Symmetry: D2
Subunit: 244 residues, 4 copies
């Protein structure tokens, strides 16, 4: 408790799923949170329960003008911005032949370009404060491949890399950038996926808050000497070899 | 020798630099090679001195229709297509703030989408033959980040990932997919870069043929059990820690 | 505050350096701690200031008999054991030609075998509890190589691997196993090394507590979905490429 | 092909399995080979059918005296030594509790220490010719973990790390050091393991010659710019995520 007191955060895709969980988890730790999404109804609903500790803003991560407005909201409403959780994302699938180029561009736009636009938007106020933490949501798909999951895999691997280059550049400014790589988590993005799809050591899928606990750690000053690194939260899947 | 005798390859960005070196190396090994680029003048000159062993085609890797045409050329002129070297690529630099969104889009288009488009085009002929080897040129920049190199890092990491997902999917078809990660190689892309810019164990930059040797190996059947893997040829850079 | 309440831990090599920091940090979070070492004077000294929540024990990690005694102490004194921090370790250097084979054997004994012995000694009480967290101290030297640092490098890579095998096996029992990889940290092991020997994004060496924060997080149930994973805390070093 | 014509190689554990395969392949590629093992009968037998190009010696990789004897045999009989294939290794298994401490020590001595002893023994003759290729045999178990396979996993990870530390140190002398990581390979070490035990993209286990082709490539000058790197030949296992 109070581990994020004094900190202001911006969470992309915070209307439902893990994003919503991160928003609630950080507020519970004393942070003021601005969260954006395209699901206005849902966003305005939780904005009501959170009250003065949060602010919902419509934010299409592929739109730089919208990122700017979301950032202006945080600075003005809460006095500044110290944390960015690039959580917004989508999932599409298809074989090398059946996957539509439009689906490919679309996922590149949201999962990759959107993360980059988030970073470009938050660097000024973060650099002014002298201390910031950027948390990019990748996945274990950003560590290994999956059949018929080319666009998703390509972008999650891309985010993994963007984390490293930006961490290196922003380090001197007092800004840390790390990537989170989870296994299967219970959210609307995977409710159609069997919960034991991956071979985990823990024998179960993850609850969103289990990833939020990691978001809180990386957002806090507790992880002050960690940057440009991959934090895996997958129940052990990537720790072992794929066995039949 | 004839390490590639009987094989047909398609090399993007083969008008100069490493690509050109790959084309010459494979032809020397008995392979028939169709190489494409946007530098037609230089490309045609090469085709001239390579006579029947090769064909130059104009190929902008961001254009799917051009990939289709390149593949048709390889099939009609040589009867098949067994190897693809996704070598075409560009490098642009810039800090998070100064970097142009147009530079970012263009590098994603060339280095990432272009690689995916090549794969899409070569799978029909390869799948019908029941074998093939796709070689994606990533870089050690696809293994770690670099200051003001966000567009390049992100795409090289993405290529690294795409290699894995496509390899898992194409395995059952008898097609292998691997990624090559070279360090500094002497080519026009880096002639403005100091040869000893990386901390290497060998104490020198790479000659383009040294990477071509790796291309020939992955293209030949002597790498029949390797797929979805990263083959590093950087003189030892990523094997060590960045010291001051 | 109380993030580790009700948890009993065992820290090897906790008489000074990071080990001591870990003891202090965890006690501050409500944990009862038994810590062993071979520096009895220093061990008894700090055990005096933490007398109510901690217990010192002489423990040579190469001696399984001493590991068992360290465990019985934790179980009888505090009622059980839920956390193990395999922190004890040594550093020796030397070229391939001059490195003494006795030094090589010695470092494998302490740094590697010692880690495995600890795990063997804590699994029973942990399984009996149905919940536990094993934290193995590797290093960035366990992620890449270093000249004249063969024994340390090999052992640190070995810990990284042992972390994974034991994690997969212990997962079904409710026990998580992870490894920490820090960069240069200010401790007596490094008093002789310039604080800026590594190329870091943060431009400074680490403070032992900065690593203890990670130990705290991995010891708590907050990291419940993380097992078999590598947690890097190196100021960004391995995130970039080694430059001259 | 005469791909290794003129080079002299020393192979440990070459009396059967992959070791024998490597010997035969290298000799077939025009190389002179000195291969050691503890199975003298089998060693002397295949040395009789290779005669004009190979020399079998008794070599227990745990004894530096025998390593020195093997090395001197290569030099005196073939005039030098340019290639070392650290192939000797053993496999034992057991859960954290049942695993005998004697099995742990034994596999450390043979799998890790033996590899190190091999390197120590060959550097002098390689440093005189300012050229050398050291090929250490790791495994995909040196990349991820396996239940009840702690000694094996640890040592294979250790070999992976030792490869990098030594490569960095030997680079200035023109000596390359790389590690090979194969998946399931049909040899007497795993004739009790179902061939489809691993999730591969290729849908089969490897023939030992498929790994030998990789040893030849690394032994050849065609890999001149690769050192301290990991060469995976596992049919795709590690490129994918463990599924159920
Ligand atoms: N669900 C999983 O198992 C899992 C595993 C690893 C990683 N992830 C990643 O975690 C993130 C969140 O996943 P989730 O499980 O909550 O999925 P989700 O579908 O529940 O939520 C994603 C959210 O992003 C929002 N969003 C989508 N496109 C957007 C855009 N252009 N602009 C702004 N917001 C947009 C969606 O409306 C939604 O609220 C994604 O990056 C996802 O790839 C999920
Ligand atoms: N030079 C290095 O040190 C180094 C290190 C690692 C990786 N690489 C990679 O190797 C590849 C070749 O690099 P290089 O060093 O020879 O660079 P290069 O500039 O000499 O050659 C790249 C080639 O790609 C062609 N090309 C560019 N855009 C294209 C497009 N849209 N369609 C088709 N062709 C296009 C260029 O005209 C050129 O002939 C690139 O993917 C590069 O990123 C280079
Ligand atoms: N100092 C660094 O920069 C750094 C970086 C990465 C990892 N590490 C690791 O962190 C751990 C602790 O490092 P440190 O910096 O505090 O070193 P340190 O020398 O201060 O402490 C190591 C401790 O282990 C104890 N010890 C040594 N041999 C032992 C044995 N056989 N049995 C029991 N205890 C034994 C020592 O007496 C000492 O208290 C080690 O595993 C080290 O490899 C240190
Ligand atoms: N079989 C596989 O699937 C597989 C997969 C990855 C890695 N490997 C590795 O490849 C190497 C060879 O494996 P293999 O499949 O041929 O096993 P193998 O049992 O057939 O051969 C290993 C050889 O090493 C020799 N040897 C054992 N201890 C020795 C010692 N102390 N001194 C000298 N020689 C000794 C044995 O007599 C034997 O001929 C080992 O390092 C093994 O761990 C094997």
């Amino acid at each position: 408790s109070g581990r994020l007191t004094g900190k202001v955060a911006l969470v992309s895709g915070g209307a439902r799923g893990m994003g919503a969980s991160h928003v609630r988890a950080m507020v519970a730790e004393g942070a003021k949170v601005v969260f954006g999404d395209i699901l206005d109804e849902e966003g305005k609903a939780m904005a009501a329960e959170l009250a003065d500790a949060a602010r919902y803003v419509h934010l299409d991560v592929t739109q730089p003008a919208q990122w700017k407005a979301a950032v202006d909201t945080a600075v003005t409403a809460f006095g500044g911005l110290h944390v960015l959780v690039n959580n917004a994302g989508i999932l599409n699938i298809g074989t090398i032949e059946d996957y539509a180029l439009t689906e490919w561009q679309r996922i590149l736009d949201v999962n990759l370009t959107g993360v980059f636009l988030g970073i470009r938007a938050v660097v000024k106020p973060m650099k002014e404060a002298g201390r910031g933490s950027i948390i990019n949501i990748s996945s274990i798909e950003g560590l290994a491949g999956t059949v018929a999951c080319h666009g998703y895999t390509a972008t999650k691997f891309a985010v993994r890399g963007l984390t490293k280059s930006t961490a290196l550049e922003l380090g001197p400014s007092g800004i840390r950038v790390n990537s989170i790589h989870p296994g299967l988590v219970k959210t609307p993005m995977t409710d159609w996926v069997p919960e034991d799809i991956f071979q985990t050591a823990l024998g179960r899928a993850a609850e969103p808050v289990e990833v939020s606990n990691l978001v809180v750690y990386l957002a806090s000053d507790e992880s002050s000497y960690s940057t440009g690194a991959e934090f895996v939260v997958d129940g052990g899947t990537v720790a072992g070899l794929a066995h039949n």
